[PDB]
Design a binder for these strands. Structure first.
Ligand SMILES: [Mn+2]
Ligand SMILES: [Mn+2]
Length: 345
DNA sequence: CGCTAGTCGAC
DNA sequence: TCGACTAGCG
């Protein structure tokens, strides 16, 4: 989420072209593309009608990257985090309801008005994503399925030096601490890049240009792991961390009302929630594309009990994690739906 | 007036 | 999983 993040730090963005990273590797939040591609074929999908138009839409961007001589790494989402295990399934029940608003309008004469309700009732299943994987693999493009949120997986790849930048429309990658995030990129290669070190150009930020504070701000402004206090967005969240300088974030959150002259009592559920939200941005389970094992996004710091971070992702035997990352074992049924072999073919 | 939170339209 | 436009509203 981090609503309005891009604008809040517009002073850190720079119009660039994909050709910039020619000869280098770039990870991609494939969903961003896969989703847009689902729009061009919303009705056919919402009617069982076989359509692969979203498969071509994704390749349209991939080929555009390859033409500029770049090594694209398509990343996909795997399992679901308990942080939002309920708010994500709420989309399912809210989708099937919208599924009827698209049929009823077609039963009144309104055609285009119903063609829009289908777009608002789209669901990106792992079956669809798999078709995109098959298409990319044949072209020689590497695909990797994150154990949980592609966000964390992408972040790791960049922080690890494996990829130099990350293509996405989701600003959360910034919160995770990505060095180079390419946003709003079209089919021609025109996008808006945000560099972490170039964040200090935003005067409005002030002293919150460090990874630790910047992450704290995103959480306070309202994230996917925790909603912001009623009446607290970016400007407010930034001001709080800006005035205070005590590393003890817990004590700061308690006196949040004091720093803002607003007396909004903080519930105990928020103090605990901020801890979880912070630990999810820090130690969410990713996947090592080299040693082929299941590791956390970052190394556990001093004050953290790894045996209490279940909401960040459950650990699984490396042999199983490898099959999930290769998109061979269904996330849901946990059965082998493919036999792709990287070592050989 | 600056900020936050609401729904809305188009791609 | 987005921004845009606008409102009340501290
Ligand atoms: Mn995501
Ligand atoms: Mn996200």
């Amino acid at each position: 989420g981090i609503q309005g993040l891009l604008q809040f730090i517009k002073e850190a963005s720079e119009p660039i072209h994909v050709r910039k990273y020619k000869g280098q590797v770039v990870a991609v939040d494939t969903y961003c593309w896969l989703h847009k591609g689902a729009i061009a074929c919303a009705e056919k999908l919402a009617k069982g009608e076989p359509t692969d138009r979203y498969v071509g839409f994704c390749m349209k961007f991939v080929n555009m990257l390859l033409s500029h001589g770049i090594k694209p790494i398509l990343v996909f989402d795997g399992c679901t985090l308990p942080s939002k295990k309920e708010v994500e399934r709420s989309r399912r029940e809210r989708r099937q309801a919208n599924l009827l608003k698209g049929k009823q309008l077609l039963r009144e004469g309104k055609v285009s008005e119903a063609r829009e309700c289908f777009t608002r009732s789209i669901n990106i299943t792992h079956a669809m994503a798999h078709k995109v994987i098959k298409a990319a693999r044949s072209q020689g493009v590497d695909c990797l399925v994150a154990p949980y949120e592609a966000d964390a997986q992408l972040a790791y790849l960049n922080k690890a030096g494996i990829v130099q930048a990350i293509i996405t429309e989701d600003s959360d990658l910034l919160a995770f601490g990505c060095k180079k995030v390419i946003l709003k990129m079209d089919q021609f290669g025109n996008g808006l890049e945000i560099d972490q070190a170039r964040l200090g150009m935003c005067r409005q930020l002030g002293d919150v240009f460090t990874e630790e504070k910047f992450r704290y701000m995103c959480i306070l402004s309202g994230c996917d792991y925790l909603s912001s206090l009623r009446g607290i967005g970016l400007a407010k969240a930034c001001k709080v961390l800006r005035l205070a300088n005590n590393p003890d974030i817990v004590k700061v959150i308690k006196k949040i009302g004091h720093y803002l002259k607003m007396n909004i009592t903080v519930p105990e559920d928020y103090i605990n929630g901020f801890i979880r939200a912070n630990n999810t941005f820090l130690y969410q389970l990713v996947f090592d594309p080299i040693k082929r094992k299941l590791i956390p996004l970052n190394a556990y710091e001093d004050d953290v009990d790894p045996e209490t971070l279940s909401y960040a992702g459950q650990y699984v035997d490396d042999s199983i994690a490898l099959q999930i990352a290769l998109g061979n074992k269904d996330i849901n049924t946990f059965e082998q739906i493919d036999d792709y072999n990287p070592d050989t073919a």
